[PDB]
Amino acid sequence: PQITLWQRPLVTIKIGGQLKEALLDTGADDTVLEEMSLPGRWKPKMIGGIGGFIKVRQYDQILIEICGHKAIGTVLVGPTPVNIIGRNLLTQIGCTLNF
Amino acid sequence: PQITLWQRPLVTIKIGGQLKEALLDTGADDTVLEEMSLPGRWKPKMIGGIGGFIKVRQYDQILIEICGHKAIGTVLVGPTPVNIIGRNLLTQIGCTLNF
Numbered sequence: 001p002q003i004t005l006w007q008r009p010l011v012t013i014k015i016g017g018q019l020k021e022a023l024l025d026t027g028a029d030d031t032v033l034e035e036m037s038l039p040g041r042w043k044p045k046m047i048g049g050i051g052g053f054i055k056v057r058q059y060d061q062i063l064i065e066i067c068g069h070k071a072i073g074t075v076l077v078g079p080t081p082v083n084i085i086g087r088n089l090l091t092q093i094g095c096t097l098n099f
Numbered sequence: 100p101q102i103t104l105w106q107r108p109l110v111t112i113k114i115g116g117q118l119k120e121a122l123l124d125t126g127a128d129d130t131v132l133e134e135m136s137l138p139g140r141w142k143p144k145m146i147g148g149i150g151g152f153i154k155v156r157q158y159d160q161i162l163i164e165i166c167g168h169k170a171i172g173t174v175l176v177g178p179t180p181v182n183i184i185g186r187n188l189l190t191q192i193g194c195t196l197n198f
């Protein structure tokens with residue numbers, strides 16, 4: 001698709017068999033989802049937002065579909081304001097900025 | 100331009116006679132820059148994300164140049180750890196997400 005930015009670029013994702021809404025965020029280096037259950041072991045990770053750094057859970061090599069496009073990569077889980085697809089998976093689906 | 104997301108989409112902007120580096124951020128509703136002076140009236144606002152919220156000053160109808168493209172819009176100024184170009188200005192330069 002070509003997605004304009006007059007509104008938030010919210011899209012449907014699928015992870016763990018579940019559909020969710022997430023924001024395509026080119027400012028986010030890393031994908032971060034709201035609290036949920038994922039398989040395997042996790043590792044600690046700090047991410048920095050506008051108000052400082054917080055600790056989230058890092059799960060690697062997670063299958064996730066984004067607007068119908070398949071990805072497998074790192075998914076962080078924590079108290080994000082909204083589900084966010086960050087540059088690590090936007091690159092995988094071949095997303096670019098254009099003007 | 101077509102901008103890759105392998106790295107942070109950092110561009111040069113010109114605002115208030117100043118050259119600055121800023122992130123093209125599709126997750127940001129608003130443009131938010133580190134502390135600087137801008138002309139005209141302003142009013143306070145709070146913006147937030149992971150880490151919490153910060154207080155900023157809101158200036159309207161500010162002229163900014165982004166990668167050579169001129170635009171007009173609201174700029175927020177405050178203690179952000181990164182200069183952010185948000186959707187309110189990305190729309191004006193014709194910026195889209197594409198995959």
Ligand SMILES: Nc1ccc(S(=O)(=O)N(Cc2ccccc2)[C@H]2CNC[C@@H]2N(Cc2ccccc2)S(=O)(=O)c2ccc(N)cc2)cc1
Pocket residue numbers: 023025026027028029030031032047048049050080081082084086122124125126127128129130131146147148149179181183185
């Ligand atoms: N990996 C990663 C890093 C940071 C974050 S975040 O700070 O939560 N976050 C997501 C978000 C917050 C609020 C609403 C919608 C999206 C950031 C990332 N893009 C937009 C948002 N921001 C830009 C940013 C902040 C820190 C580092 C790099 C960029 S922001 O400053 O919080 C912001 C929030 C609200 C408005 N109006 C304008 C700007 C999330 C994941």
Ligand SMILES: [Cl-]
Pocket residue numbers: 072073074088089
């Ligand atoms: Cl990854």
Ligand SMILES: [Cl-]
Pocket residue numbers: 171172173187188
């Ligand atoms: Cl505006």
Ligand SMILES: [Cl-]
Pocket residue numbers: 004193
């Ligand atoms: Cl348009």
